[PDB]
Amino acid sequence: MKFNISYPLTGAQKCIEIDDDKKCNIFMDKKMGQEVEGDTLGDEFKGYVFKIAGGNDKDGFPMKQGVMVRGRVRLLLSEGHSCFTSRRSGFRKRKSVRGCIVGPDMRVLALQIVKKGVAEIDGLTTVTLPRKLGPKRANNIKKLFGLKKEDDPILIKKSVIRRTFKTAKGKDRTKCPKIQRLITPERILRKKVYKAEKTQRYVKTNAAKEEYEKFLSEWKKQRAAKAH
Amino acid sequence: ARGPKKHLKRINAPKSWMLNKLGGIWATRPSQGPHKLRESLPLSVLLKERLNYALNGRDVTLILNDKEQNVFVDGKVRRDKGYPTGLMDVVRIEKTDQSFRILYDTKGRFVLKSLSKEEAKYKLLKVTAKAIGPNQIPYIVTHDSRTIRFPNPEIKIGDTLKYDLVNNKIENFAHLESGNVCYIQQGNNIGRVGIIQHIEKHQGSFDICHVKDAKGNAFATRLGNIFVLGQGKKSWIELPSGDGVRETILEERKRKFSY
Amino acid sequence: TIVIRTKKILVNPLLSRRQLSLDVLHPDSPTASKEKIREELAKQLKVDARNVVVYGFSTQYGGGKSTGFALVYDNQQYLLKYEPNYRLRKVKILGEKPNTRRSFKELKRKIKRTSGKAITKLLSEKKGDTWASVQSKKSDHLKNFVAK
RNA sequence: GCGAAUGGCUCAUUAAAACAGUUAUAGUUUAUUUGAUAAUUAAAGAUUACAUGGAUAACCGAGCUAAUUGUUGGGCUAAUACA
RNA sequence: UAACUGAUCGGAUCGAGGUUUACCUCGAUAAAUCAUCUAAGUUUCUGCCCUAUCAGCUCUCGAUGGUAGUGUAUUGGACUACCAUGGCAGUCACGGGUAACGGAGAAUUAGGGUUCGAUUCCGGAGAAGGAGCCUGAGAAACGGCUACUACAACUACGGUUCGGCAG
Ligand SMILES: [Mg+2]
Ligand SMILES: [Mg+2]
Ligand SMILES: [Mg+2]
Ligand SMILES: [Mg+2]
Ligand SMILES: [Mg+2]
Ligand SMILES: [Mg+2]
Ligand SMILES: [Mg+2]
Ligand SMILES: [Mg+2]
Ligand SMILES: [Mg+2]
Ligand SMILES: [Mg+2]
Ligand SMILES: [Mg+2]
């Protein structure tokens, strides 16, 4: 059996082989999204805790969660399902899926390290994956950068991350994100102008109403004075 | 039929456009707008066929997408190739300062009436509905799909307002009664112009009115196709030159070729 | 000699050109090459040669006449902005339109059948002559121009 | 987002059916168009308005199938997206 | 004027040109209501070829009408419950046939007729056969999905197909 092991902090991913029927007896008849002791697997796994996050059939079929059965079942997948992609708006498909329950028919299991024990596997500890794509939204910057709410927009401006890199051509370049949500003069102007539109609405209407009214009384004065 | 139709075939495009039978398969389907599809003269025809300012399709696009804002309808810019310029509209081309009014001649094809600057401010409007609106505000509605608020209360339904397009202020109006001047928007009597003799209301369905012209030939048409041209014998518009009098082909041939 | 009667003249500010119907009389000669008709027309109307586009000529049966059309743009700026691309090739300004369809449809094939990264890698290889490159050659030719 | 409901093809069904010309909708629906409206942002709760909140794709990384415009886990950040 | 719902709307969005920049002038777009365009659903009246080796037809769950409902975008036996016994027919009902889609039209034509219209335009219908859906403003879509009947393509046999020339 093959185990795709991912762990969240480092962003570690390695995948491992076990041919022992005895070693793999553990995951059998365990539903997905379950906690596993790493000890009963191997020695390098002493003290480890895994979450069974999914897996794949011999035939490639991924496990849907909540489908509770061991082996494949055919479903009608509407939009917003795992195992599925909508080609069109209303879209449904008969799809073959793998159940939640782990059998021997599974070539692959996806494992989430929850608690790592004393035992040290290389790619979990060794690696630190970098930070690419810093925060974009104004408030997200302020937060993740530790800035006050009362603070000036220019402090947000000055604290956005820079990216620096070397072009495959060998050139030297630097790229910056744009801040969305940012409070700029333009936003405030647009706001002022909209409120203007409103106030103009009821003003103009009022002035019309009164113009009509006075014209009216004049016109009825003439209309009744035409009668005698 | 699975919903809306987006195309128009040349054979089916109205005779009033005078398109070539052989010119293609399709013609331009008029856009949803102020005027109906059959009462539309679209912009693309206005430019390509009539003014010849556009020689082909690409050209029309050029004119209407050029940042320079070339064409105007009732004072407001239009960039839409299929915009339904309808009856009584004033279309103005900024580069030449040409100001035309959209009309039917006696033969029922579409014509551009050249207007001087004083004419081009004014446009004639015909009352469709009259109601009390929300907040108890009286309102009025027009053939070109205007909604006018606080109308002069004397204005009845099916009148003709003379509308200042600079001021968006109705100036003078006149209603449908014996003795006023009409133009006829739709009919076999399309394009003819005349003094209303009287009106008969049949009250189940369709009210018919009768007409005379300067020469004294009577007409009749349903009320819906009458458009009022002003008070008296005088029209508030410069008419394409027939003056609104139909000519017998005998009259036509005589005057034209001297028989 | 070539005589040119100039016939129907519409002044078109919208596209800022003059539109023209032409009548060429070549009583002893074959139909006139456009180079000559251009040059004679420019001689008449005093404008530049490359400011005038000449198109759609019909020699009649028996060969005394041809009827054609002409365009005269106010500045070659406009002319360079209005005439479509196949014409700028007739005037040698632009280039060849290379074979589009086959390529484009096989690209459509592969594109539909994969996702983003690979798709971009295919788009890098597209055989098109870009709108960018068009406006670039246009501008450059407008920069190599000399007024008469 | 929008479109994919047009277009193109065919005449198998179909004899008051469909269709045609005439009507009704005061018995209805209509995305895109044109014109006109809009003072109060229910209550509880919440309440920054110099402007609120949490996600995800592309991307990076690890996979499964003999097989497809199949998709599974993991690490990122936007929106006129979702609140 | 009562209340009721909160499942309606009441802009946390974008450009551009700038008077030198804290303020102007043009626009893009989202969306509610009412008109308006566009198109549709239903709908009034009248009009089809051959046949009596079709004279009665329709009504056990709707046939004609009446009531309350229900459902729908709306009207309606469209559907349900109760009630009444109607509705159509020699002025041809009902039922067969059509190598029948209907028109605009076409070939012939002294006049009157005869015979065609699958096929440019407008309607209608269908996407191998049936049914059923999703999503939309609009669909029973078919160059969308689900199933069956009958078939088409891969397969390492376990699976799969952006499988549907009346484009
Ligand atoms: Mg359009
Ligand atoms: Mg009525
Ligand atoms: Mg080209
Ligand atoms: Mg029958
Ligand atoms: Mg009927
Ligand atoms: Mg993730
Ligand atoms: Mg600025
Ligand atoms: Mg027939
Ligand atoms: Mg058809
Ligand atoms: Mg119909
Ligand atoms: Mg074929």
Side-chain angles (χ1 to χ4, degrees), chain C residues 11-33:
Chain C
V11 177
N12 187 337
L14 300 187
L15 312 184
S16 48
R17 60 188 185 192
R18 314 199 280 243
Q19 296 167 351
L20 245 232
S21 204
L22 280 184
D23 264 50
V24 186
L25 325 195
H26 50 253
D28 302 338
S29 296
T31 299
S33 51

PDB file of all heavy atoms in Angstrom, chain C residues 11-33:
ATOM      1  N   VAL C  11     -18.180  64.432 -49.485  1.00  0.00           N
ATOM      2  CA  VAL C  11     -17.225  64.839 -48.472  1.00  0.00           C
ATOM      3  C   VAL C  11     -17.612  64.178 -47.158  1.00  0.00           C
ATOM      4  O   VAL C  11     -18.702  64.409 -46.635  1.00  0.00           O
ATOM      5  CB  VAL C  11     -17.172  66.367 -48.317  1.00  0.00           C
ATOM      6  CG1 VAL C  11     -16.220  66.748 -47.211  1.00  0.00           C
ATOM      7  CG2 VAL C  11     -16.718  67.003 -49.610  1.00  0.00           C
ATOM      8  N   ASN C  12     -16.707  63.358 -46.630  1.00  0.00           N
ATOM      9  CA  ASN C  12     -16.995  62.542 -45.457  1.00  0.00           C
ATOM     10  C   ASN C  12     -16.075  62.911 -44.307  1.00  0.00           C
ATOM     11  O   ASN C  12     -15.019  62.312 -44.145  1.00  0.00           O
ATOM     12  CB  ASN C  12     -16.844  61.048 -45.788  1.00  0.00           C
ATOM     13  CG  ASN C  12     -17.295  60.132 -44.649  1.00  0.00           C
ATOM     14  OD1 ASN C  12     -17.335  60.530 -43.489  1.00  0.00           O
ATOM     15  ND2 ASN C  12     -17.628  58.890 -44.985  1.00  0.00           N
ATOM     16  N   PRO C  13     -16.483  63.897 -43.494  1.00  0.00           N
ATOM     17  CA  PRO C  13     -15.714  64.301 -42.313  1.00  0.00           C
ATOM     18  C   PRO C  13     -15.608  63.184 -41.279  1.00  0.00           C
ATOM     19  O   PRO C  13     -14.587  63.089 -40.599  1.00  0.00           O
ATOM     20  CB  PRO C  13     -16.545  65.453 -41.739  1.00  0.00           C
ATOM     21  CG  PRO C  13     -17.922  65.232 -42.272  1.00  0.00           C
ATOM     22  CD  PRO C  13     -17.700  64.710 -43.648  1.00  0.00           C
ATOM     23  N   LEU C  14     -16.651  62.366 -41.165  1.00  0.00           N
ATOM     24  CA  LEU C  14     -16.709  61.297 -40.171  1.00  0.00           C
ATOM     25  C   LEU C  14     -15.471  60.418 -40.209  1.00  0.00           C
ATOM     26  O   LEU C  14     -14.842  60.164 -39.181  1.00  0.00           O
ATOM     27  CB  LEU C  14     -17.960  60.447 -40.385  1.00  0.00           C
ATOM     28  CG  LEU C  14     -19.250  61.248 -40.277  1.00  0.00           C
ATOM     29  CD1 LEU C  14     -20.473  60.341 -40.332  1.00  0.00           C
ATOM     30  CD2 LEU C  14     -19.214  62.031 -38.989  1.00  0.00           C
ATOM     31  N   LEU C  15     -15.132  59.956 -41.405  1.00  0.00           N
ATOM     32  CA  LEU C  15     -13.910  59.197 -41.605  1.00  0.00           C
ATOM     33  C   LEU C  15     -12.814  60.116 -42.128  1.00  0.00           C
ATOM     34  O   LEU C  15     -11.696  59.677 -42.395  1.00  0.00           O
ATOM     35  CB  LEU C  15     -14.167  58.015 -42.538  1.00  0.00           C
ATOM     36  CG  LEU C  15     -15.419  57.223 -42.128  1.00  0.00           C
ATOM     37  CD1 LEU C  15     -15.637  55.995 -42.989  1.00  0.00           C
ATOM     38  CD2 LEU C  15     -15.372  56.825 -40.659  1.00  0.00           C
ATOM     39  N   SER C  16     -13.149  61.401 -42.243  1.00  0.00           N
ATOM     40  CA  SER C  16     -12.237  62.440 -42.739  1.00  0.00           C
ATOM     41  C   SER C  16     -11.535  62.034 -44.026  1.00  0.00           C
ATOM     42  O   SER C  16     -10.315  61.871 -44.071  1.00  0.00           O
ATOM     43  CB  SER C  16     -11.233  62.870 -41.668  1.00  0.00           C
ATOM     44  OG  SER C  16     -10.637  61.745 -41.059  1.00  0.00           O
ATOM     45  N   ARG C  17     -12.337  61.865 -45.066  1.00  0.00           N
ATOM     46  CA  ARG C  17     -11.848  61.559 -46.392  1.00  0.00           C
ATOM     47  C   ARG C  17     -12.857  62.116 -47.382  1.00  0.00           C
ATOM     48  O   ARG C  17     -13.918  62.615 -46.995  1.00  0.00           O
ATOM     49  CB  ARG C  17     -11.753  60.048 -46.569  1.00  0.00           C
ATOM     50  CG  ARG C  17     -13.088  59.335 -46.397  1.00  0.00           C
ATOM     51  CD  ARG C  17     -12.917  57.827 -46.376  1.00  0.00           C
ATOM     52  NE  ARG C  17     -14.194  57.125 -46.337  1.00  0.00           N
ATOM     53  CZ  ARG C  17     -14.323  55.829 -46.079  1.00  0.00           C
ATOM     54  NH1 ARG C  17     -13.253  55.091 -45.823  1.00  0.00           N
ATOM     55  NH2 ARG C  17     -15.525  55.273 -46.068  1.00  0.00           N
ATOM     56  N   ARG C  18     -12.530  62.013 -48.662  1.00  0.00           N
ATOM     57  CA  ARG C  18     -13.478  62.318 -49.713  1.00  0.00           C
ATOM     58  C   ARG C  18     -13.709  61.018 -50.441  1.00  0.00           C
ATOM     59  O   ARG C  18     -12.757  60.306 -50.764  1.00  0.00           O
ATOM     60  CB  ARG C  18     -12.912  63.337 -50.703  1.00  0.00           C
ATOM     61  CG  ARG C  18     -12.227  64.544 -50.090  1.00  0.00           C
ATOM     62  CD  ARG C  18     -12.146  65.663 -51.107  1.00  0.00           C
ATOM     63  NE  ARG C  18     -11.051  65.495 -52.050  1.00  0.00           N
ATOM     64  CZ  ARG C  18     -10.027  66.339 -52.148  1.00  0.00           C
ATOM     65  NH1 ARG C  18      -9.969  67.400 -51.362  1.00  0.00           N
ATOM     66  NH2 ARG C  18      -9.059  66.136 -53.034  1.00  0.00           N
ATOM     67  N   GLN C  19     -14.972  60.712 -50.701  1.00  0.00           N
ATOM     68  CA  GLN C  19     -15.329  59.499 -51.404  1.00  0.00           C
ATOM     69  C   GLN C  19     -15.675  59.850 -52.832  1.00  0.00           C
ATOM     70  O   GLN C  19     -16.265  60.899 -53.099  1.00  0.00           O
ATOM     71  CB  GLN C  19     -16.480  58.813 -50.696  1.00  0.00           C
ATOM     72  CG  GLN C  19     -16.090  58.365 -49.311  1.00  0.00           C
ATOM     73  CD  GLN C  19     -17.279  57.974 -48.475  1.00  0.00           C
ATOM     74  OE1 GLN C  19     -18.426  58.194 -48.864  1.00  0.00           O
ATOM     75  NE2 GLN C  19     -17.014  57.387 -47.315  1.00  0.00           N
ATOM     76  N   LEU C  20     -15.290  58.969 -53.746  1.00  0.00           N
ATOM     77  CA  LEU C  20     -15.245  59.314 -55.153  1.00  0.00           C
ATOM     78  C   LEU C  20     -15.691  58.191 -56.069  1.00  0.00           C
ATOM     79  O   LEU C  20     -15.306  57.031 -55.887  1.00  0.00           O
ATOM     80  CB  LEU C  20     -13.815  59.695 -55.531  1.00  0.00           C
ATOM     81  CG  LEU C  20     -13.567  61.131 -55.968  1.00  0.00           C
ATOM     82  CD1 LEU C  20     -12.829  61.165 -57.294  1.00  0.00           C
ATOM     83  CD2 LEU C  20     -14.872  61.865 -56.062  1.00  0.00           C
ATOM     84  N   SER C  21     -16.499  58.543 -57.062  1.00  0.00           N
ATOM     85  CA  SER C  21     -16.659  57.665 -58.207  1.00  0.00           C
ATOM     86  C   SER C  21     -15.797  58.241 -59.327  1.00  0.00           C
ATOM     87  O   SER C  21     -15.711  59.458 -59.494  1.00  0.00           O
ATOM     88  CB  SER C  21     -18.128  57.526 -58.624  1.00  0.00           C
ATOM     89  OG  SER C  21     -18.352  56.309 -59.335  1.00  0.00           O
ATOM     90  N   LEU C  22     -15.138  57.350 -60.062  1.00  0.00           N
ATOM     91  CA  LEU C  22     -14.209  57.712 -61.126  1.00  0.00           C
ATOM     92  C   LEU C  22     -14.613  57.149 -62.488  1.00  0.00           C
ATOM     93  O   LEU C  22     -15.157  56.041 -62.592  1.00  0.00           O
ATOM     94  CB  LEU C  22     -12.801  57.215 -60.801  1.00  0.00           C
ATOM     95  CG  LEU C  22     -11.878  57.954 -59.840  1.00  0.00           C
ATOM     96  CD1 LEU C  22     -10.534  57.251 -59.822  1.00  0.00           C
ATOM     97  CD2 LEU C  22     -11.712  59.404 -60.246  1.00  0.00           C
ATOM     98  N   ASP C  23     -14.327  57.926 -63.528  1.00  0.00           N
ATOM     99  CA  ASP C  23     -14.475  57.476 -64.901  1.00  0.00           C
ATOM    100  C   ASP C  23     -13.166  57.682 -65.643  1.00  0.00           C
ATOM    101  O   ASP C  23     -12.750  58.814 -65.866  1.00  0.00           O
ATOM    102  CB  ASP C  23     -15.586  58.257 -65.605  1.00  0.00           C
ATOM    103  CG  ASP C  23     -16.912  57.533 -65.585  1.00  0.00           C
ATOM    104  OD1 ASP C  23     -17.335  57.083 -64.501  1.00  0.00           O
ATOM    105  OD2 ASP C  23     -17.536  57.413 -66.660  1.00  0.00           O
ATOM    106  N   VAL C  24     -12.524  56.586 -66.030  1.00  0.00           N
ATOM    107  CA  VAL C  24     -11.295  56.661 -66.809  1.00  0.00           C
ATOM    108  C   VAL C  24     -11.586  56.429 -68.296  1.00  0.00           C
ATOM    109  O   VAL C  24     -12.283  55.481 -68.662  1.00  0.00           O
ATOM    110  CB  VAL C  24     -10.261  55.629 -66.326  1.00  0.00           C
ATOM    111  CG1 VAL C  24      -8.943  55.825 -67.046  1.00  0.00           C
ATOM    112  CG2 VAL C  24     -10.067  55.742 -64.832  1.00  0.00           C
ATOM    113  N   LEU C  25     -11.074  57.310 -69.152  1.00  0.00           N
ATOM    114  CA  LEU C  25     -11.222  57.141 -70.597  1.00  0.00           C
ATOM    115  C   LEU C  25      -9.860  56.835 -71.215  1.00  0.00           C
ATOM    116  O   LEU C  25      -8.970  57.685 -71.214  1.00  0.00           O
ATOM    117  CB  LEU C  25     -11.819  58.390 -71.252  1.00  0.00           C
ATOM    118  CG  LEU C  25     -12.864  59.268 -70.558  1.00  0.00           C
ATOM    119  CD1 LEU C  25     -13.518  60.182 -71.591  1.00  0.00           C
ATOM    120  CD2 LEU C  25     -13.930  58.491 -69.796  1.00  0.00           C
ATOM    121  N   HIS C  26      -9.704  55.622 -71.737  1.00  0.00           N
ATOM    122  CA  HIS C  26      -8.433  55.181 -72.304  1.00  0.00           C
ATOM    123  C   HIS C  26      -8.638  54.631 -73.710  1.00  0.00           C
ATOM    124  O   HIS C  26      -8.264  53.496 -73.995  1.00  0.00           O
ATOM    125  CB  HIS C  26      -7.835  54.091 -71.418  1.00  0.00           C
ATOM    126  CG  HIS C  26      -8.801  52.996 -71.081  1.00  0.00           C
ATOM    127  ND1 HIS C  26      -9.361  52.853 -69.830  1.00  0.00           N
ATOM    128  CD2 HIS C  26      -9.318  52.001 -71.840  1.00  0.00           C
ATOM    129  CE1 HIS C  26     -10.173  51.811 -69.831  1.00  0.00           C
ATOM    130  NE2 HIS C  26     -10.165  51.277 -71.039  1.00  0.00           N
ATOM    131  N   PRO C  27      -9.172  55.463 -74.615  1.00  0.00           N
ATOM    132  CA  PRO C  27      -9.767  55.004 -75.878  1.00  0.00           C
ATOM    133  C   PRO C  27      -8.868  54.123 -76.744  1.00  0.00           C
ATOM    134  O   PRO C  27      -9.384  53.283 -77.481  1.00  0.00           O
ATOM    135  CB  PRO C  27     -10.074  56.309 -76.614  1.00  0.00           C
ATOM    136  CG  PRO C  27     -10.123  57.357 -75.549  1.00  0.00           C
ATOM    137  CD  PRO C  27      -9.101  56.933 -74.548  1.00  0.00           C
ATOM    138  N   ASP C  28      -7.561  54.341 -76.701  1.00  0.00           N
ATOM    139  CA  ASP C  28      -6.636  53.533 -77.489  1.00  0.00           C
ATOM    140  C   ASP C  28      -5.928  52.429 -76.712  1.00  0.00           C
ATOM    141  O   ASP C  28      -5.156  51.664 -77.290  1.00  0.00           O
ATOM    142  CB  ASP C  28      -5.593  54.426 -78.159  1.00  0.00           C
ATOM    143  CG  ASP C  28      -6.218  55.483 -79.051  1.00  0.00           C
ATOM    144  OD1 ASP C  28      -7.379  55.287 -79.487  1.00  0.00           O
ATOM    145  OD2 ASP C  28      -5.545  56.510 -79.316  1.00  0.00           O
ATOM    146  N   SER C  29      -6.182  52.346 -75.411  1.00  0.00           N
ATOM    147  CA  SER C  29      -5.314  51.562 -74.536  1.00  0.00           C
ATOM    148  C   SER C  29      -6.015  50.527 -73.654  1.00  0.00           C
ATOM    149  O   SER C  29      -7.226  50.593 -73.452  1.00  0.00           O
ATOM    150  CB  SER C  29      -4.486  52.512 -73.668  1.00  0.00           C
ATOM    151  OG  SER C  29      -3.617  53.287 -74.479  1.00  0.00           O
ATOM    152  N   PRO C  30      -5.245  49.549 -73.138  1.00  0.00           N
ATOM    153  CA  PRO C  30      -5.735  48.608 -72.131  1.00  0.00           C
ATOM    154  C   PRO C  30      -6.145  49.333 -70.863  1.00  0.00           C
ATOM    155  O   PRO C  30      -5.817  50.509 -70.684  1.00  0.00           O
ATOM    156  CB  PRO C  30      -4.514  47.732 -71.843  1.00  0.00           C
ATOM    157  CG  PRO C  30      -3.725  47.775 -73.080  1.00  0.00           C
ATOM    158  CD  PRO C  30      -3.908  49.164 -73.623  1.00  0.00           C
ATOM    159  N   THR C  31      -6.890  48.633 -70.011  1.00  0.00           N
ATOM    160  CA  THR C  31      -7.336  49.162 -68.727  1.00  0.00           C
ATOM    161  C   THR C  31      -6.151  49.720 -67.961  1.00  0.00           C
ATOM    162  O   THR C  31      -5.065  49.141 -67.970  1.00  0.00           O
ATOM    163  CB  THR C  31      -8.029  48.071 -67.896  1.00  0.00           C
ATOM    164  OG1 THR C  31      -9.188  47.601 -68.598  1.00  0.00           O
ATOM    165  CG2 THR C  31      -8.448  48.610 -66.535  1.00  0.00           C
ATOM    166  N   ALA C  32      -6.358  50.865 -67.326  1.00  0.00           N
ATOM    167  CA  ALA C  32      -5.275  51.575 -66.663  1.00  0.00           C
ATOM    168  C   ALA C  32      -4.891  50.978 -65.312  1.00  0.00           C
ATOM    169  O   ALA C  32      -5.736  50.783 -64.442  1.00  0.00           O
ATOM    170  CB  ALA C  32      -5.637  53.038 -66.499  1.00  0.00           C
ATOM    171  N   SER C  33      -3.603  50.699 -65.150  1.00  0.00           N
ATOM    172  CA  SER C  33      -3.060  50.280 -63.867  1.00  0.00           C
ATOM    173  C   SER C  33      -3.317  51.353 -62.818  1.00  0.00           C
ATOM    174  O   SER C  33      -3.261  52.544 -63.119  1.00  0.00           O
ATOM    175  CB  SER C  33      -1.560  50.014 -63.989  1.00  0.00           C
ATOM    176  OG  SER C  33      -0.893  51.109 -64.597  1.00  0.00           O
TER     177      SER C  33
END
